[PDB]
Structures are given as structure tokens and as C-alpha cells.
């Protein structure tokens, strides 16, 4: 059971893919273990650089393949180095950029918060053959968050576990568990742009829609209702052209639907108010009371919506 | 006739491209067979990792090439391993990400349901030379479907078959059959987003369009009809900018066309009512009757559509 | 002069790029010739798979390079095999996916019809050194055309030709000709989507635009004309955001221009009728006349255009 | 100083990237020089194909690296061949597809005209070590200009020069010169599409905007002005969504700004006419003057700006 | 401590990605150091080209791997050469294209100013093993800035520093410092396009929106306000579809929000004027006053909001 100590440096996380639930991570990976002692040039450690590494494998060196479980396709392995010590220690250091997978819930967008995970596991060697001892994940402070799309909330959380693959061969008695490293980094989306350039104008438009009941004529009210409908449609289009593709309704989508329904209920109430009573009465109490009740009814419906 | 037992682990299915009829599949592939026995270091099984694999082949090891039939270009094979047992067993294990093709019908979108298929076949060796014994496909449960784009409905269906290529050589007596593994996985699209953010606003706009006959003046009616047409145009624009490119009409496209035809028929009826009777009679009976005859008749039209 | 018999299996054609005039083609390529006999294990033919291929070339085996002339960049070569027969026969079989070029005229879109071409030619060896004997192009029937964007109409047309590169050396007497295989596949675009969601709504919008002359007042007519102009603009925008990039006007672009001109001529005719006569006359007869002359006149203009 | 004669075949130029000032070039490159004589298999010249080339380099063959200076990243080198003659001649032939950069000015778009340049230079050897003797550039006729986006004006123009890199070491006396081949191909953009589907509808919209002064009432004029503003806005959006991204104002952008300013000046003139006279006399005389003075000053500006 | 002198030639900077804070840089990298003398053919230095370089490493040539710190994934290594001198000097020259990251603040867009940085560092060798001696950064003048997207303001600033990695082993006394080269290039964005086609039309639209108070009727004012709102919505749509994605509000976004607020305050003031005094007195004094307070107050608040 070989003891392996790892350390993963994280340079950047970016490239959010909402539909595919992937994210790009660039950083470093260090893995250290202890092998048979060896003679080096002098007693100083030996340095082996990318191509030369393969040579040592062809001559019998054991370098285990550590696979990113949650990765998406072969990542872009940058420079890689082996440091070989005379006492047998071996250190594998590699720059890596890769697309990783994780369950991501975007329903509370733009106020969502996610957690980027990394999953390391030996590809061929089990835990009875090769064991994980140490994890250390370092994230740069970068406290000037205002510029970045995402805000990291705390340093990385680690988790070593043992994964049991049930569905395997039947001649292998007990060598079916593997040592898996899982790294989690919580982060929150910066909603400033969506607050100011999406939410605030939408609320202003809906308030303007409420301002329809201050028209004197019925024809004016009903005709302007369609201008309001078209306004909401154009705004929803601008929205959808900017916002990311998704298979569920975002919060902004819900505000859009709320504006649609408010205008629809306004049209219904306008028609009803004009054609309610007898003796050619428009029920002036209904119109001039709705002129202030409609904002409060909608605000109560929205405070119930946030639940 | 070599008996090969395979096992395909499916990690993720995503990236549907509607125009190309492709979908990306990331997972593992395992293949086991029995060859001539071999001496290993001790009687313990030997493990060979990516680069060294090629070396063993150059010294005479026979590793057959298994091609994904329905694949699109060279897939991205990640880490790969050979496990060699002293009794002759050989196991090939490889991580793979690839884009696959299949007939996909999106006419009932966004309520469509598809089936992702995989087709494995030996590239050069026929069925009289190399045979498939077992198929085993494992899919993760992933029971929090509400977030995922597609909902897997059931376990995978497998089928070993014999494929016969007619157009071949003329010296080949009986070596013209191949062993093909076929895996099918049914799936259904999540229609929530298109129901709430597309279907509901489209229907609400169509109802608001119906509300034109409740106008008193004729000029108001005809002038407002054009604002309604422009609303439907902007809505169809927003729709088409979001929805996937396709060569046929989706259900939503049909609803857009239905809104167009509804407004056009409304304009025709408005003109008819204004100039049906003599001496400039409005024919208010027609206007009042269609005020509620358009909804029932159009729902009947859509019902005869759906069936 | 080596006789080479080829066979090209065409699995799928897709991914047309209008601006680049490229299209993606995935299939197989087979090339067969007869060489000096060779010793195999037994008298059964020998099979060589991807990597080992290079070894055989390095030991003196002659494998000619066949270049796709009309391809765009290095294609994605999948699995490849060499079949070596004891009598000297050699068969090269390779899976290939590539982007190919051909002159493509999209003026009649969405009613255009194109033909996908493939051009094979030996890269270095001339016709006095290497000759093409047979071509056979196989495409699966796939008679369920309704799903696919393009409809293949008949089997591929083949043509062996000899191409003479003029600009060559001046000491070379006659070794300047090459054997080129040309494959052509005619196909027609499925216009259903563009028929129903583009052409039909456009005609409906243009007829509704003509319906402006049924307004009683002049001011109503002129004010509504601008709502119609904006409607056409929004429609052209929807179109252009959806339709493929091109450097020339499609049929749909001309229909957009036709709607533009119809609305503009309508505005011109409205002003003319308002100010045709002296003493504040409206020339209502002109409005009544154009009310039906615009359908007839514009459809006569469209039918003269379609000749 | 070795004399090297090259030959560049140009198959296609496409894929202009406006922001990056890049263009895709697909063609062939041939380079010939004369070396020490050599023994061939038989007395006929020997042909070496892609993979074998590297082997021949390891055995002492001198093949200089010729770099495309203005290229962007590693181009896609397809098949490459060495033709070795017994008299010592060496010919390197390779298919190449690459993205190239050059100063491109798009200010007069869609009436712009550009020139595609290619820049070849030996990577390691100077002019005293390796010299360019001949250039021969072959460009396809492509006389079906109506379909192609760009019109080539003439065959390629070439220019060999010697480049001196100032910023270098101080021990190198005069070996700081390199032989650079420069190929230039002038071309003019076909403006038909942008003329008919962009310029003409925009001018028609602006003329309709001029038609505001023929409204009788003041309220009609001022209220219609805002729908006209909205029309220009929607058109400008359609424009910018189709037209290529750029860091400067195109001619079409200038026409958009001209329409905007025309509508704004129209609003100014409308309000001025309404309140130029005391007691708010409408001053219809000003409207009757400006209705045909405004297009006059506009088209005067349109002819002036051309200078 | 090996002294290494570098030289970085910068060919082009482009491809700014606002969300990822990356930019593509193409140029050359030169590295010079002095090793033990060597026998060459003659006294002229020996030149080694790309592939052969790798061979020389397997036979014992020491070429240190220098990594770009701020790069994103393996850069696109073009041609590379080794020049070996008899006096012991060794020079590595390589063409490179890569994606680089740096803190980039786009808040003052379109007047933003950024700085493109490059960070060079040895991958495996520390400063006691390998040191940087000289920096020389050469940038082409390119003084025709008007065409290019970005304008470089001054020549590059260079800086050698020593970077200390804390998290390392604990037996290593002082081998925790590395020699880092830092290159900074200030640059300013070309605002012409965003000035003329975005800022100026937006200001004209806002002034036109102010021109609503010159309407005589109350209904005219209130109904026209909604057309103005819709105009602002379409304009914001056009902007956001063209402008680059960002997580914060640009200056242009602030102007859009300001137009929104102007229209909303105009509606508020209209309603207030309609119901300011008893009996729904319209308060013509309020309209007179606001006709000049709204523009002047907007100028004052806009001048306040920038300091
Ligand atoms: C309006 O808001 C709308 O409310 C319903 C009910 O939550 C949601 O509807 C969706 O979520 C709920 C659960 O939360 C599911 O039971 C429902 O089948 C699904 O369609 C829409 O996603 C949301 O947009
Ligand atoms: C109206 O909606 C539209 O009408 C017709 C009805 O079939 C269909 O249009 C299509 O129909 C069938 C295919 O099913 C074809 O024979 C027909 O040539 C084609 O135009 C569209 O699929 C549908 O979306
Ligand atoms: C208006 O319709 C549009 O007008 C232009 C000008 O003719 C045409 O464009 C083309 O027309 C004819 C071809 O016969 C040529 O003389 C012209 O140079 C070319 O631009 C479009 O094909 C057509 O769609
Ligand atoms: C309106 O057209 C617009 O006018 C201005 C002023 O000329 C131009 O502006 C451009 O040229 C002028 C000089 O001629 C410079 O002062 C200015 O810095 C530059 O951006 C725009 O590029 C052009 O699109
Ligand atoms: C409109 O103006 C809008 O005001 C808010 C709050 O000031 C800004 O929002 C941001 O900027 C300011 C700093 O200037 C911060 O205090 C605020 O917490 C932050 O969310 C938007 O970036 C800006 O676009």
C-alpha cells in the first residue's frame, strides 16, 4: 500500500457552462511518494523534464496515473517534472488546465452559489496497492473581488474517502476499493450587473405598467396595454439574448412572467371595469380604487412568491 | 473465435446538437478476453499504463481495435490501462469522451423524447475471428432530475447482433459477418423552461390579441391589430433567437404560426364586420359573437391538431 | 504504373457552413493494389493496426499518400488498418471525418439545391507511377428524408480523370499527369421550416400591411403605416438573426425588400391621394381603387419576378 | 549562400476576421534547392512521404524551416513530401492551411478594399547561409465573381527583400540580414448585398421619416416622431447584429447616426414651428417649406460627405 | 547559478476576453546562457531545428523549461531552434502564441485602460540553480492606432524579481526562491465606435424623450411615455447584444439606467401634474418649469455622478 501525498495549487476557475455543468480550472498538481533509493549525480536531487519523463518509464520507473474523475475529456497537461531523490523520494509536478463536472443549480440565478469540485483517483492502482496520505489545496487571496465574475468564500475543503466499485470481475476477491480525493470550493455569483441592468429596469417597467390606470379614457387604457405587452416582450428578448441557456426558469424569468401576468390581469380588469354594471356605469369606484390597490395586490403576491 | 466480454460505464450524456443529430458521451470502456498464458512478475497481475501499452504491442502483443460505429471523428481517449493476468486474461480499460450520431426527431419539441445509442464493433476482425459474449452497461442514478437537461427513463437496453457487409471481396468464403454491440438509452427533455417562459407567454399574448373585439370604435380595432402583429413578431424573434436551429417546425413554431393566423383572421373579420351590412352598419352581432367564438373555435382547431 | 482500386463508404454528410462554403463528411476509404508476395503467419492474410503501420513503412513498405483535394485542413483520421495478403495484395482501410470545399450557390435559398463533391488524388506519385482502376461509392439508403436537413436524390456520380499540372519542371518530358477521382452527390434542401415559419408569416404580414387603405381617416392611415414599417423591420431582424450568413441577397432577403417597398409605396400613394386634387378633396376613389389594386399589382410584380 | 526557389499555390482565401485582422489561406507550398548529389533506388528520383521525412532528417538531411512571419499560430500542415533527385536537387512540397494577419482597414465598409499578404522567411538561416531566388505564386481564376465575397483584382504581386533586425547581439558583425518573401493580393469587397438589403431599406426608412411633415395636426407629428425613432433603433440593432464587429464607425453606422440626427432635428423643427410665433400660431408655412427643404439639405450632405 | 539572458519580441496582442480576463499574445522568445564549450563543424555555430532539438535532450543536452506563469493552457509553440556556439554559448529561440491572464478592470469602459503582462519563470530550476540576467522587450511601433482595436501608450516596462513559494519542503534551507521576469504593456481602448454609435444616439434619444412635455394633452404625454420606454428597451437590447459580456455595469449601462429613470420620473411628474391641485388641476406651471428643470437637473446629476 503506497502512501502518496498530494498538493493542488489552483490558479484560476472560469468558463462556467450552465447547460453542460462544466467549469475550467487551471493550476498545479504535486504528488509525492517514496520509492527504492537510487544513485543520482552527486547526492543532489535529479530533475526530469516533460519528454525525458517517458524515457524513465520505458526503463522501468513506476509513475502512477492519477485521473481526474469529474474532468471533461483529456485535460491540457502543461509542463511536467519529476524530481528524483537519492533516498527514493519521487515528486511529480504538473501544470494542468481542465474542464470539470459537478451538479450545479442555477434556479436562484443571479443569486446562485455553486461549489467547484475536483476528484482525483488512481486510475489503475487500488487502495490496497496505493493510498492517499495528504491533501493541500491553496487558493490565492485575491480579495479585490469587485472585478471578478465569481467570489470565492473560503479556502478549499478536502475529503479523502474510499470508493467501492461493485460491478467488476468475479475472480477479484477484495481488491475493489480505491482512494479518492475530493476538493470543494464554494463560490457565489456577483449579481451586480443583473441587479442594476436587469432587475431594476424590469421593476421600473412594471411600475410604469401600473401607471396605466391613470388614463381617463377606456380606449386609451386598452390600447396602451398592448404597448406595455410589447415592451415586456422586447425586454424579455433582450434578457434572453444576454442570459445563459438553461433548462429551468431563473429568478429573472419569474419576474418576466410576473410582468406578463400583471399586464394580463390589468387588461382583464380594464375590460371588466368598463363592462360590469348596468345603466352604462363603468364602476368608477373600481377603477379609482384599483389605481392604488393593483400595486399593493402585486406586491403582496410577490412577497408570497419569495418563499 | 475469440470471446470478448465488455463493460461500458456511462458517466455523462450532454451537448445535444439538434442540427447535426449528435450528442456527447463521456464514460469508461472495459474489454476482457483470454489469450495465451504469460509469466508476470510473481503470479500477481501486471498493470500497464498509457505509453507503455504501445511498447507491448511493438513486441508482438495482440490488442484488437474496437471502433465506435456511430461516433463522429476520433473520440478523446483519456487514461488507458492493460491488466494482464498470468492465466492469460487480458483487460483493456479506457476513459473516453466522444460525439456520437443517431437519428433524432425533434418535431414534438419541447416535448420530444430521444434515445442515445452506442454501437461498438471490432474494426478489422470478423465474427468468425472474434466474438462478443457479454454486454454490461452501468448508468448513474442521478435522481435529482429537476436540474438536468434530459431525464433518463430506464436502464440501458443492450443487444449483440451480427452485421453483414455485402460489398466486400470475392475471395472471402464466409468471413463477411461482424459482431456488433448496440446500447440504447431512452431520455426525455425537460420542458419546464419552455412551458413557463415560452408557451405560457405565447398563449397569454394570444388571449390579449383576442381582446381586440372589445374595442368600441372600428379605427381603434384596426390600428390596434397592427400593434398586436408587431408584438407577435417581436415574440417570434425572441423565441427564434433562443430556440435551437432546426429544419422543421417545432410545436412552438406551430403556435407562433397559429398566433399569426389568428391575428390575420381577426383583421379579415374586422373588415368584414365593418363592411358586411349596408349603409355602414357595424354588424355588432358579429363582433360580440366572435368575442367568444374565436377562443372556442381556436381551441377546437388546436384539439383537432393534437389528437 | 500501379493499378489502385478504391472504395469510399460515405456514412454522413452534415455541418454545412454557408460563409466558408464547406461541409463535413464522415465515412471510410478503402484502397487496394497488388504488390510482391510476402510471408504471413500461415496463408491467411495479415492485419496491421494504426501504430504498427509506421513500423512497416520504416522497414520499407510502400504506402502511397492519397490526399483529399477539396478538403479543408487535415481530416480527423480514426482507426486505420492494413490488410496484407500472401499473394502480395495490399488493402488500406481508414475511417475519416473531414471538412470539404466546393463551389456552392445559395442565391435560391431556401429553395437552393447543391452537390457535395469529393476529390481524391495521390499526393506525390503521378499517373505513370500510380493509377486508379475502380471507384465504388456507397451511401446508405436512409429514405426517411423528412428528418434530415438535406435530401440525397440519387447515388453518387463518379469520374476518373487525369489532371495535368502545367507549372512544373522543364526537363521532365511527360511525367506531369495525376489520376484524380471525383465523387459528386446531388442534394436538395428541406424548405419546410422556411416555408411555414418564414414565407407564410411574411405573406400574412404583407397582406395585413395592404389592409391599411381600409382606414377612413387619412391621419389614421399615415400613422399606422409607421407601425407597419416597424413590423417589417422587426421581422427582417428576426430573419437575419436566424438565417445563415451570406455575401449576397437570398430569396427571403428580396421578399423583405419587397415588403419594404410595398409599405413605402403605400405611404407615397397615401400622400398622393391626400394631395392629388385642389380644394381639399381626398380622391377617395383612388383609395378604394388601390385597396384592391395593391394585391393585384404587387402579385403581378411578384409573378413577373418569378419567371 | 544557398539559393532557394519557392512556389506557393493558393487554393482559397476566406474567413476574414475583422477584429483580429486575420484571414484563412489554404494552398500548397513548394521549395526547391540544389544540394550534393545522391544515390537513389534505381537511377529514378526518390520520393519520401510525411512520416519518413523525419527519419531522413535524423540521418543528416538538411531541410530548412521556412516560417510564415505574419501567421497566427501553428498552421495545419497536411501531407508533406520530399522529392530527392540523384543530381542533388531537393524539393519540399506541403499542403498548408493557416490563419494570417495583415493591416486591414474597414472604415469604408462595405466599399472597403483590402490586400492579403503572406510573409515567408527562413527561421534559423540568414541570407549569407540561405537565400531566396525565385517566387512563383499561382492563384485560381475564379471568374464567377458574383458569388464570391471578394473580387481579386490581379494575379499575385511578389517582392523579395533583405530584412535587418537591429535589436540583436553586438558580436555579430554583419550576419543580421534575412531573405524575406512578400506576397500581396489586392481585392475589393462586393457591396451588392449590403447595398440592397442594408442601404436601400435604411434610405427608405429615412424617407418615410421625412414624410412626417405631411401630417396635419401637431400632436400627430410629434407623437409619430417617437415611433420613427423606435424604427431607426430597431433597424440599427438589426444592422449591428448582422454586420461584423469593428472598433470604428462603418459607413452604415454613419447612415444610422444620420437618420438619428435627422429625426432629432425633425423634432426640434416641429416644436419650433409650433412655438415660433407668439400665441402659438402653428406656422404651417414653415412645414410646407421644410417638407421639401429637408431632403434637399440631407442629400446635399450625402453628396458632401463623400469627399 | 546559471545566468540566462532573455529577449521577448511581441508581434501582436488581440482577442481580449472580458469575462475571462484573458488576451492572446503572439511573439518570439529568446533565451541565452553559457555552458561548457563544444566542438562544432568548423568554428561556425551549429543550428538545430524543432524535431532534432528533442533528440539532443535525450543524449544529454540541458535545456531548461521556462514556463509562462500567467498563461492559460499549453501555448501554441511554433518553430523552435537551438544555436550552439563553440565558445559555450547556447541560444533557444521559439515562436509562441498563447492566452494570458491579468487583473483587468472594465468599469470605465469604453474609456478603460488595461495592461497586458507576461510572467516568465523557470519550471524546475530555482534561483540558486538558474537565474535571469537581462530583460529586453521589443515592440513594433504600429503608430497607425486609428485602425487597431487597442492603442499601446508607451514601451514595455520590464522587471526581474524573486518569487518565494512558502508551501514547499522544510529541509530545503534556501532553495525556495525563483527568478521571475515581469513584462507590462499599458494600453487604452479606442472609444470612437462606442462614442459615436452608442453614446451619441443614446443622448439624442434621451433628449427626444425630454421633448414629451411640449405635448398639449395629458393623454398624449402619458401614452407617448410608453413608446419612449419601449425605445429605451430596444436600445438597451441593441447595446447589450453588441457590447461584451461583463459582471458589472459599464458607463454605457449607467446611461441606459439613467434614461430609464428619466422616463420613470417623467411619468411620475406627469401624474403629479394631473393631480397636484384639487379638482385634478393640470398645473401648467409645473409643465413649464419641468421643461427646463428635467434637462438641467439631468445635466447636474450626471456631472455629480462623475468625480
Ligand atoms: C412562475 O414560477 C414558476 O412556478 C413553478 C412552481 O414552482 C415552477 O414549475 C416547476 O417547478 C416546480 C417545483 O418547484 C415543479 O413542481 C414543476 O413541475 C416545474 O414545472 C416554475 O419553474 C416557475 O417558473
Ligand atoms: C401549420 O403547421 C405546419 O403545417 C404542416 C402540416 O403537416 C407541416 O408542414 C409539413 O407537413 C408535412 C410533414 O409533416 C409535409 O407533407 C409538408 O410538405 C410540410 O409542409 C408542418 O410540420 C406543420 O408544423
Ligand atoms: C431588388 O432585388 C435585388 O436587386 C439586385 C440588383 O439587380 C440583384 O443583384 C444582382 O442583380 C443583377 C443580376 O441579374 C445584377 O445586375 C446585379 O449587379 C446584382 O447585384 C438581386 O439579385 C436582387 O435580389
Ligand atoms: C459621423 O462620422 C464620424 O465623425 C467623426 C469625426 O470626424 C469620426 O471621428 C474620427 O475622426 C476624427 C477626425 O476626422 C477624429 O477627431 C476622431 O478622434 C476619430 O474618432 C468618426 O470616425 C466618424 O464615424
Ligand atoms: C447606476 O449606478 C449604479 O449604482 C450602484 C450603487 O452605487 C453601483 O453598484 C456598485 O457601485 C458602488 C460603487 O460605486 C458600490 O457602492 C455598490 O455597492 C456596488 O454594487 C452600480 O455599479 C452603478 O451602475
CSV table of N, CA and C in Angstrom, one decimal, chain A residues 202 205-206 209 225-239 255-263, chain B residues 201 205 231 234-235 238, chain E residues 230 233:
chain,number,residue,atom,x,y,z
A,202,UNK,N,-36.5,46.3,-15.0
A,202,UNK,CA,-37.7,45.5,-15.1
A,202,UNK,C,-38.8,46.0,-14.1
A,205,UNK,N,-40.2,49.2,-15.4
A,205,UNK,CA,-41.2,48.9,-16.4
A,205,UNK,C,-42.5,48.5,-15.9
A,206,UNK,N,-42.5,47.6,-14.8
A,206,UNK,CA,-43.7,47.1,-14.3
A,206,UNK,C,-44.4,48.2,-13.5
A,209,UNK,N,-46.2,50.1,-16.0
A,209,UNK,CA,-47.4,49.4,-16.4
A,209,UNK,C,-48.5,49.6,-15.4
A,225,UNK,N,-52.3,49.2,-23.1
A,225,UNK,CA,-52.0,47.9,-22.5
A,225,UNK,C,-51.2,47.1,-23.5
A,226,UNK,N,-51.4,47.2,-24.8
A,226,UNK,CA,-50.7,46.4,-25.8
A,226,UNK,C,-49.3,47.0,-26.0
A,227,UNK,N,-49.1,48.3,-25.9
A,227,UNK,CA,-47.8,48.9,-25.9
A,227,UNK,C,-47.0,48.3,-24.8
A,228,UNK,N,-47.6,48.2,-23.6
A,228,UNK,CA,-47.0,47.6,-22.4
A,228,UNK,C,-46.6,46.1,-22.7
A,229,UNK,N,-47.5,45.3,-23.2
A,229,UNK,CA,-47.3,44.0,-23.6
A,229,UNK,C,-46.0,43.9,-24.5
A,230,UNK,N,-46.0,44.7,-25.5
A,230,UNK,CA,-44.9,44.6,-26.5
A,230,UNK,C,-43.6,45.1,-25.8
A,231,UNK,N,-43.7,46.0,-24.8
A,231,UNK,CA,-42.5,46.4,-24.1
A,231,UNK,C,-41.9,45.3,-23.3
A,232,UNK,N,-42.8,44.5,-22.6
A,232,UNK,CA,-42.3,43.4,-21.8
A,232,UNK,C,-41.7,42.3,-22.7
A,233,UNK,N,-42.3,42.1,-23.9
A,233,UNK,CA,-41.8,41.1,-24.8
A,233,UNK,C,-40.4,41.5,-25.3
A,234,UNK,N,-40.2,42.8,-25.7
A,234,UNK,CA,-38.9,43.3,-26.1
A,234,UNK,C,-37.9,43.2,-24.9
A,235,UNK,N,-38.3,43.5,-23.7
A,235,UNK,CA,-37.4,43.4,-22.6
A,235,UNK,C,-37.0,41.9,-22.3
A,236,UNK,N,-38.0,41.0,-22.4
A,236,UNK,CA,-37.7,39.6,-22.3
A,236,UNK,C,-36.7,39.1,-23.3
A,237,UNK,N,-36.9,39.6,-24.6
A,237,UNK,CA,-35.9,39.2,-25.6
A,237,UNK,C,-34.5,39.7,-25.3
A,238,UNK,N,-34.4,41.0,-24.9
A,238,UNK,CA,-33.0,41.5,-24.5
A,238,UNK,C,-32.4,40.6,-23.4
A,239,UNK,N,-33.2,40.3,-22.4
A,239,UNK,CA,-32.9,39.4,-21.4
A,239,UNK,C,-32.3,38.1,-22.0
A,255,UNK,N,-39.6,37.0,-12.8
A,255,UNK,CA,-40.0,38.4,-12.8
A,255,UNK,C,-40.6,38.7,-14.2
A,256,UNK,N,-40.1,38.2,-15.3
A,256,UNK,CA,-40.6,38.4,-16.6
A,256,UNK,C,-42.1,37.9,-16.7
A,257,UNK,N,-42.3,36.6,-16.2
A,257,UNK,CA,-43.6,36.0,-16.2
A,257,UNK,C,-44.5,36.8,-15.3
A,258,UNK,N,-44.0,37.4,-14.2
A,258,UNK,CA,-44.8,38.2,-13.3
A,258,UNK,C,-45.3,39.5,-14.0
A,259,UNK,N,-44.4,40.1,-14.7
A,259,UNK,CA,-44.8,41.3,-15.5
A,259,UNK,C,-45.9,40.9,-16.6
A,260,UNK,N,-45.7,39.8,-17.3
A,260,UNK,CA,-46.6,39.4,-18.3
A,260,UNK,C,-48.0,39.2,-17.6
A,261,UNK,N,-48.0,38.5,-16.5
A,261,UNK,CA,-49.3,38.2,-15.8
A,261,UNK,C,-49.9,39.5,-15.3
A,262,UNK,N,-49.1,40.4,-14.8
A,262,UNK,CA,-49.7,41.7,-14.2
A,262,UNK,C,-50.4,42.4,-15.4
A,263,UNK,N,-49.7,42.5,-16.5
A,263,UNK,CA,-50.3,43.2,-17.6
A,263,UNK,C,-51.6,42.5,-18.1
B,201,UNK,N,-46.4,32.6,-22.0
B,201,UNK,CA,-46.4,34.0,-22.5
B,201,UNK,C,-47.0,34.0,-23.9
B,205,UNK,N,-50.3,36.2,-24.7
B,205,UNK,CA,-50.3,37.2,-25.8
B,205,UNK,C,-51.5,36.9,-26.7
B,231,UNK,N,-46.3,42.9,-31.9
B,231,UNK,CA,-46.0,42.1,-30.7
B,231,UNK,C,-45.7,40.7,-31.0
B,234,UNK,N,-42.2,40.5,-32.6
B,234,UNK,CA,-41.1,40.6,-31.6
B,234,UNK,C,-41.0,39.3,-30.8
B,235,UNK,N,-42.1,38.7,-30.4
B,235,UNK,CA,-42.1,37.5,-29.6
B,235,UNK,C,-41.5,36.3,-30.4
B,238,UNK,N,-37.7,36.8,-30.4
B,238,UNK,CA,-37.1,36.4,-29.2
B,238,UNK,C,-37.0,34.8,-29.1
E,230,UNK,N,-40.3,51.9,-24.5
E,230,UNK,CA,-40.1,50.8,-25.5
E,230,UNK,C,-38.8,51.1,-26.3
E,233,UNK,N,-35.9,50.4,-24.3
E,233,UNK,CA,-35.7,48.9,-24.1
E,233,UNK,C,-35.0,48.4,-25.4
